[PDB]
Amino acid sequence: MKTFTAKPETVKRDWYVVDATGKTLGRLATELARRLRGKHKAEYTPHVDTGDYIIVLNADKVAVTGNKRTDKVYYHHTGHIGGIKQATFEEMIARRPERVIEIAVKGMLPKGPLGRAMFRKLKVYAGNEHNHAAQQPQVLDI
Amino acid sequence: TCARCDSXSRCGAXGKXSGXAS
Amino acid sequence: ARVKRGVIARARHKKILKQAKGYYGARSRVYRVAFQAVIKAGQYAYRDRRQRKRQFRQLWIARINAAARQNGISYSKFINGLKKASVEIDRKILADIAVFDKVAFTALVEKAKAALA
Amino acid sequence: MRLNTLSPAEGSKKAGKRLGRGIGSGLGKTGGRGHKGQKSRSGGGVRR
């Protein structure tokens, strides 16, 4: 016979709340990108998005080690004459701390259409309250 | 045909005129 | 004896154009492009009969590691436990049991855990 | 003994090199002559 393939129209997804308070950035983000892809399910197919919906909260209280809070720099280029723009870690935390978790996870996810549809299942929040209480998110201990 | 047109080739384009009749 | 070429040339072109169906643009309409496309598809078929075994091995190992961690053991400890018990089930069948029969896979994980120590 | 039942002895009627007939005949693309130089030219080769 043939190897099982999870059909993308009967994949059962769940909802999880992770509190990112005081955890290391990438050491939380790799378990995020692991469960977003579906590597924790025995029915995992690489071309199907079998992963879970994940809600991350308190993302302005995420911890980094070393001297990285004043020295980890994020670079983006706008596409122009000068173009190169440059913000440190704590500036990103003061400015929009959802993008810290989202840049870490989007880097740890595959590229292409399916990796973006995996990134779409990540709901990051800088507060302690969220809006998906209808989804009944069971609590995840990451 | 016979108009020439380059400084010096056997046949290129060129708006000059001593090299160039294809 | 003079030999016209047109019939056998037409047959040799129609074979290549028949093997080029589905292709984009001149790759399915034009003999010069379709011949290169058919030979390139042949090289890919040769390379990917080898690549298929590697990819299915990767998928089987990813599903075994997923279901073993669903049961509380890593991949390497689980394969060590199935070697230290003399169990010859390959990774295709272990992935199939990991998908379809989770209680039988739980039995195999308990066997490998008891053999592991 | 009819005219469509005769046949030569084996080893009598070797075919002959036809040069320049594709990859798979062994003698396409320069046909046994190698690459450039005086010997591969038409009418080439030095005298006795």
Place this chain on the structure above:
Amino acid sequence: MYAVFQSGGKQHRVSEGQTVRLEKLDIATGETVEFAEVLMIANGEEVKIGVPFVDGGVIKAEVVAHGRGEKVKIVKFRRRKHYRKQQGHRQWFTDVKITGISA
């Protein structure tokens, strides 16, 4: 109840009544083969292996068909170096029909 056996260097997971495409055996098209090297018999309560063979289980199958699969095309091409080979290949198989699992 299903069962894992091993015929052509490969393993197969099969139930009562499936057709299995194996590599070619030297068995005629009417004889019921017996695979005595069975690696797992499973049910709600399952007989796995300890030592690698189930000692008290055996699988029996009616040989249905001998045949050959799709013609596959081997293309060896070496660019700019004046070399290609085309080759065909059809692989022999034996379709057996699993008539009995003996736990």
Place this chain on the structure above:
Amino acid sequence: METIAKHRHARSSAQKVRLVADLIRGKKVSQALDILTYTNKKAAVLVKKVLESAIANAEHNDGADIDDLKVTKIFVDEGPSMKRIMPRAKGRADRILKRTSHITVVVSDR
């Protein structure tokens, strides 16, 4: 019942006549005649004669009931082009393709 009219070897490019033939496909024929009447292309003049001739061939040959008819199938094919010489500068000769069309209108009440 299908009823075909053709203008074979029409002296217009196929690309020009297809732009007018895509106006009146699927339309009723009474509406398509007015669409072609108030269209300011030369191809409208060419394809209106073919449509009117299809109406008349339906009426005279077998047909029915001009209120019923639709323009179900209209297509333009490329015809035999004429080859002409166009002198250009510096003794260069271009060719002119004088492109012809075949215009086909199938009218059918059902």
Place this chain on the structure above:
RNA sequence: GUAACGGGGCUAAACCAUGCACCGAAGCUGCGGCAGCGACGCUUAUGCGUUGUUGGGUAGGGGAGCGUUCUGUAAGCCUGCGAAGGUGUGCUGUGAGGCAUGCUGGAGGUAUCAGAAGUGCGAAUGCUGACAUAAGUAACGAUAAAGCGGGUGAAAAGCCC
């Protein structure tokens, strides 16, 4: 343009030492199949349940074949109950290929075994013909200049008045 870990990230997910696990190739092994060279069980127009070993390949050498046109076989065999050719489908050979039929075609084709070649094309800024592309794009050939009424006509900025 971050630009001297590929990247994300990492205080180990860094370095050294000790191990054991595991992944990892077209390597080795398992199952099936083909072929080349040297040789043993049965035994010859020798076939192999066999069994040792070998099988990447350019220039090049050697060996075996397929197809095309024409000639003999052949005033024979198929064919208007449908030949050649064209267009699909299926089956088959390790390959060049081959076989059988649907439709189109409307009068010739040719088994096998031999023979002879104007015998096989993708390239030569190849040659001839056809058709694309740029593209319905530039341009419509002196910047002396036209406007209206009537006529003819299927239709008039251009023809006649």
Place this chain on the structure above:
RNA sequence: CCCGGCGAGGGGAGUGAAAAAGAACCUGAAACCGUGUACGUACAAGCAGUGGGAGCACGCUUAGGCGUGUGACUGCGUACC
């Protein structure tokens, strides 16, 4: 005979074995250009394939996870001489 300009071109009728022989005339290939239908395509990057593969359409057998067409997504993959 009918449309049209006492056009060109076409539709009938008729001749014929045949107009899938109408003179732009046996056979009618390919490039090229269309019409209709099935599927895909408007958040997605590259020699356009290949390996896997969901869904859909249409034949299936009277379930059997297979054919034919398309191919979301995914691993690998920088033409030929």
